[PDB]
């Protein structure tokens, strides 16, 4: 109903306000914590020798955390004018796909650096393939309705989506570890929680397109997504905050 | 026409054979050259320090070459029994997409390792995002025809596609170079040649769905893909062969 549409304008505006408040809070309180992006270039032939790692760029973590919070705050304020409905008049939500393409990619990169993924190409590619996951979900919503035909776009998203995490799992397990590799307790919590949040985002899409009575109303799904952006970003933002100090 | 389809059954079988002959050549003559995939794991917390880089897995390059050649050989022989024909009886070719999803990801990973990219997660991710490019192109053929709405999967693919080349450029330019860094001339040849070949694959897809007079025959596009797959995989296979042996 349009009455639900109206509640969504108010709902988004509040979601944005919470993201905005936390963004400012982090900006006020966070220290100057930075993580490295490096390159290990060749000293010659491909399989002969490598030049020692050079730090190309560093990531100001507090600003980066504020950044993905800022992206949600911003997009919710844009949406609050009723534009997402104006783009309907099932529904489709491009605003969300653009927002997530940016913010979920910003934050998966943070998680990687936290694990120890320093290489600049790795972090770039992870950002790219995470964006692909979001863009596949967008294509699901663009070309199909809640019917059998939505399978592929979704599952292509799952393929692009699962990879980043597999990379993290490699570093968490550390196949080449020589016993001096310790992963912090707060890191393990960040990975698990955020992984479980990413799974629920996939779950919303699935159920929404599967068509379960409850989720036959697109707007229940829309609202559930908005909460997940809010809860998952908050969770990571304050876990990293606490962990930076720990 | 169905006549053209039968011609394509032969054309694939011949292309497959050309891929197979080059595969077996490499397997016969190639060295035991291999490139490392590494992990540089943290010792402690994020901002402390790192443990020495460890080689997790090394890539047998000759075999990796035979792998993307063989995969093409394999799918061309499969197709040659007249399976893809059902899309005519613009069409679709998911044998292409399944094949390319694998074989071109194998070969882009090789190029990365040739450039000095060794981080196992980087190479994992590059592979993943290259597959995403192919899968976007698949979706272009699945849900669209020669109409405006065809563009979006294509452009999503272009984005996912360029990300690997951006990474390669980082290692070629070497922003943090301290003057001891050097890249072999043959690597510049590999990158430029294959980069143009990857661009032309997109060019075909574009012109085919753009509906340019010539390319309004879907099977003309198909023939282009068969030739490009052959030449681009060949070009890389032998440039690597020359440079590693
Ligand atoms: C702050 C916003 C966040 C963390 C949004 C994350 C979005 C997801 C993890 C979406 C994932 C999807 C799948 C895994 C399958 C394809 C459909 C999506 C885009 C809903
Ligand atoms: C051996 C086969 C190879 C090297 C195939 C390469 C395929 C591509 C580079 C396809 C690229 C595409 C775009 C860049 C846009 C999206 C559509 C595609 C898949 C045609
Ligand atoms: C399209 C993404 C490019 C990157 C920068 C985008 C900044 C966000 C702009 C808001 C997009 C909201 C949806 C707009 C829908 C439309 O294009 O008509
Ligand atoms: C994970 C699935 C979450 C589904 C949504 C849970 C309730 C969130 C608040 C909904 C408010 C509403 O629908 O009006
Ligand atoms: C390496 C030199 C070229 C290899 C030649 C491969 C030929 C494969 C195609 C088989 C031709 C027979 C096709 C049967 C029907 C027909 O000719 O129309």
Numbering used by the authors:
A (entry chain A): 5 to 93, 98 to 254
B (entry chain B): 5 to 93, 98 to 253
Show passages lifted from the paper.
Heliorhodopsins (HeRs) are a new class of Microbial rhodopsins (MRs), with a low homology (<15%) to all other MRs and a unique membrane topology in which their N-termini face the intracellular side and C-termini face the extracellular side. To explore the photoactivation mechanism of HeRs, we sought to solve the structure of HeR 48C12 (hereafter referred to as HeR). Despite the unique topology and low homology to other MRs, the structure of HeR shows a typical seven transmembrane helix bundle of MRs. Overall, we have reported the novel structure of HeR 48C12 and mechanistically addressed the key physiological properties of HeR, such as pump/channel activity and the long photocycle.
The most striking feature of the HeR structure is the very long extracellular loop 1 (ECL1) that is mainly composed of two antiparallel β-strands, which has never been seen in other rhodopsins. The structure also revealed that HeR forms a dimer. Compared to BR, several key residues are missing in the HeR structure. In the Schiff base region, the key residue D212 is changed to S237 in HeR; and most dramatically the key residues for proton release, E204 and E194, are missing in HeR. In contrast, the ‘tunnel’ formed by TM1, 2, 3 and 7 of HeR is filled with hydrophobic residues, e.g., F88, V83, F72, V69 and V65 of TM2, L118 of TM3, and I9 of TM1, which occlude ions from passing through this tunnel. Our structure shows that H23 and H80 are isolated from detectable polar interaction to the proton transferring chain centered at E107.
